[PDB]
Amino acid sequence: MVTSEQLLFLEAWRAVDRAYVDKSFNGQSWFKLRETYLKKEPMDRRAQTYDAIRKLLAVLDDPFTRFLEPSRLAALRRGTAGSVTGVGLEITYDGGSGKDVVVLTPAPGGPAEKAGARAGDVIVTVDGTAVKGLSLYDVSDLLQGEADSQVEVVLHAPGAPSNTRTLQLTRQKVTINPVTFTTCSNVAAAALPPGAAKQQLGYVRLATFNSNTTAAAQQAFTELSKQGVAGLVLDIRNNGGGLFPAGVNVARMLVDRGDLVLIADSQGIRDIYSADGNSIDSATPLVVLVNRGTASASEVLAGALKDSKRGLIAGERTFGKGLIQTVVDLSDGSGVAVTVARYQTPAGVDINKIGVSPDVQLDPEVLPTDLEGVCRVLGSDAAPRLF
């Protein structure tokens, strides 16, 4: 009893049937839905088939698992770093039923940031258009405009739905500097590891994972190692993640041996990344600063450092953003955006759920990120007890 529509619809259910990270399918029977859908859903034109697929998708309750019509799967292939400007915002969906779009993290030194926008903030409206239930690609499309434009954005601090802040922001192309680093001298007793033969700390700010990150980090650890600093301070607060291989890369710069990250699903581990025995410094004491703005590849890195005992985790519990998606192409040029995998720390911890918890519960905001500032605080009498 075959149709062109049914076939397409089945490709879409299959993709999912076969790739979805959770084989309990939001506790639905994926196979029975198939039946139900072929039976009760109108698939007389492709448009209708598209709708049924969409419907089908939503039962899952995974905002990252979405259908892509051929236009977006074009528009989406590569290209938005270009002549397209935004407001230094990095967005994602909320905690439980995350209908909500939140600021993952605001681009450091970005117009949104320099305006009061913080990690955890809920995005209420962009230009008057509510954003709940909306795609990220869609939301980005509202955020995006051109150079010199403006856009008003209304947020609210998490849990404070009334606590509403409106932000009129000026569109600017925002490059995030991957890394910053310095040596801090005359560091205060309280912030120095226990065995410190020298009142120096190497501080490294690692703000994002990108194409430049690896080279910039190699630089920092190299130089700092040379300086013979007493301890290391890796600050990955408010760092959304980004390039995963860059995360491994840095992890392999500090960890000489051991697993770093596990990639798993419903069914068990799919992949594993381990150290290569090539670190830069596997020996200087290291404290890693994190906060709730630490996500994804930055959390992978946190868990690697932690589970390896390479370093202490200081600050506050990270994002809990551990899902990996992908796009499965349909025969007619459309696509299915699906979560196919999840990150786990070497110890078996599920990133997505739990997040990476600190060893040294600290008051995360203690340190600034600007260099001068950072050393001062560290040289202060009130310096934080990092280790």
From Swiss-Prot:
Coiled coil: none annotated. Monomer. This is C-terminal processing peptidase, chloroplastic. Optimum pH is 6.2. Keywords: Chloroplast, Hydrolase, Plastid, Protease, Serine protease, Thylakoid, Transit peptide. It comes from the Eukaryota. It is an enzyme of class 3 (hydrolase). It catalyses: The enzyme shows specific recognition of a C-terminal tripeptide, Xaa-Yaa-Zaa, in which Xaa is preferably Ala or Leu, Yaa is preferably Ala or Tyr, and Zaa is preferably Ala, but then cleaves at a variable distance from the C-terminus. A typical cleavage is -Ala-Ala-|-Arg-Ala-Ala-Lys-Glu-Asn-Tyr-Ala-Leu-Ala-Ala. The lineage of its organism: Eukaryota, Viridiplantae, Chlorophyta, core chlorophytes, Chlorophyceae. Belongs to the peptidase S41A family. Protease involved in the C-terminal processing of the chloroplastic D1 protein of photosystem II. This proteolytic processing is necessary to allow the light-driven assembly of the tetranuclear manganese cluster, which is responsible for photosynthetic water oxidation. The keyword Ion transport does not apply. One of its GO terms (cellular component) is chloroplast thylakoid lumen. Its main location: plastid. The active site is at residues 296, 321. Transmembrane segments: none annotated. Its EC number is 3.4.21.102. Residues 73-158 form the PDZ domain. The keyword Protein biosynthesis does not apply. Not inhibited by antipain, 4-amidinophenylmethanesulfonyl fluoride, aprotinin, chymostatin, 3,4-dichloroisocoumarin, diisopropyl fluorophosphate, E64, EDTA, EGTA, iodoacetamide, leupeptin, pepstatin, o-phenanthroline, N-ethylmaleimide, phosphoramidon or phenylmethylsulfonyl fluoride.
